[PDB]
Every structure is written in C-alpha cells, then in structure tokens.
Design a protein around this ligand. Sequence first.
Ligand SMILES: [K+]
Length: 124
Amino acid sequence: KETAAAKFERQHMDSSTSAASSSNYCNQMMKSRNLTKDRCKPVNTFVHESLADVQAVCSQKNVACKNGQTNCYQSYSTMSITDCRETGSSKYPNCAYKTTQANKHIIVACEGNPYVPVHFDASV
Ligand SMILES: [K+]
C-alpha cells in the first residue's frame, strides 16, 4: 500500500519542531506515526530539518549502505535529530521510549524521481 518514500516520511520526518520538545516527545510521536501499531518498534530516528533539506541529502556524499547496496548518501551538514529507544517497562500497546536529542550527519538510501530518501541507514 505505502510507497517507500512515503514510509520514510512517516517514520523519519518531523519538520514541525526544531528539536524534541520534551522527554515525552518519543512516546507521542511513535504512536502518532503508527510505529506502535502492531508492536512497539524498538528504535527510530526523527529528523527535524525541512523536507527540502532532507531530500537534498540525496544529492550529497554518496556512500555504501550498511547492507552493501550503493545508493546511500551522507549529509554534508549536521542535522537536528531525535533518537527514540524503547525502555524496559514498555508493554504493547503502552509503548515507552527514551528521547535523545542530537545534531548528527544522517545517512539515507535514495530512489525515484524525484530522487528522495527511502530508508534511514544511520547517523554519524
Ligand atoms: K531509525
């Protein structure tokens, strides 16, 4: 049903804030993006730059992907991200997360026309 590009936006884009707004940000966001739909997804990163700036990474530094595929790119600039990681007391569907705000380079895989992120590979 969902395209890879759309799934990337749903899982990974949040340009409505410049940084995580509270320790509760991940709990809210993982739910609202359907990352707690069938289970508590263990780990997920949200990026807080404009969609234009994130899509632009697909025109930046070409690097290998973790899986050995070739169409990954590392942002030239650091970018505002939030890491959401599940905690020990989490019981589905009351999924509980620790929130960590950071300013990291992102690495994404890109596909399509327009050429846009379809996978979040890592941050550095
Ligand atoms: K992630």
